[PDB]
């Protein structure tokens, strides 16, 4: 049916926006703090903190097999990042600060990528 293709057409455009949101969201960090997943060989125990990791890699590779249904979703997984590093990582810590810096400038990001998400469709 073409009534799935335009949903895939939204879906992949929404991919198309997310993509450059991403890209955007990542140059934020030039530390690269949060590009790849945290180790369970060099943290063993993170699981035992952070029920739900997440990070930019995952997101894209998530992102690439178009498995965001929606800015909201993509925000989710984004905010996490944020969330669990702020969790994990006292306040005085650089990975903290990061977090906190990411945040701030992703939500203008964010905020003009809710526009375009409703102004497009």
Same mark, same amino acid.
Request: proline share 3%; net charge negative.
């Given at each position: 049916?073409?009534? $799935?293709?335009?949903?895939?057409?939204?879906?992949?455009?929404?991919?198309?926006?997310?993509?450059?949101?991403?890209?955007?969201? $990542?140059?934020?960090?030039?530390?690269?703090?949060?590009? $790849?997943?945290?180790?369970?060989? =060099?943290?063993?125990?993170?699981?035992?903190?952070?029920?739900?990791?997440?990070?930019?890699?995952?997101?894209?590779?998530?992102? =690439?097999?178009?498995?965001?249904?929606?800015?909201?979703?993509? =925000?989710?997984?984004?905010?996490?990042?944020?969330?669990?590093?702020?969790?994990?990582?006292?306040?005085?810590?650089?990975?903290?600060?990061?977090?906190?810096?990411?945040?701030?400038?992703?939500?203008?990001?964010?905020? $003009?990528?809710?526009?375009?998400?409703?102004?497009?469709?």
């Amino acid at each position: 049916s073409m009534e $799935q293709v335009a949903m895939e057409l939204r879906l992949t455009e929404l991919t198309r926006l997310l993509r450059s949101v991403l890209d955007q969201l $990542q140059d934020k960090d030039p530390a690269r703090i949060f590009a $790849q997943p945290v180790s369970l060989k =060099e943290v063993p125990d993170y699981l035992d903190h952070i029920k739900h990791p997440m990070d930019f890699a995952t997101m894209r590779k998530r992102l =690439e097999a178009q498995g965001y249904k929606n800015l909201h979703e993509f =925000e989710e997984d984004f905010d996490l990042i944020i969330d669990n590093c702020m969790k994990y990582n006292a306040r005085d810590t650089v990975f903290y600060r990061a977090a906190v810096r990411l945040r701030d400038q992703g939500g203008v990001v964010l905020r $003009q990528a809710r526009r375009e998400v409703d102004s497009i469709g």
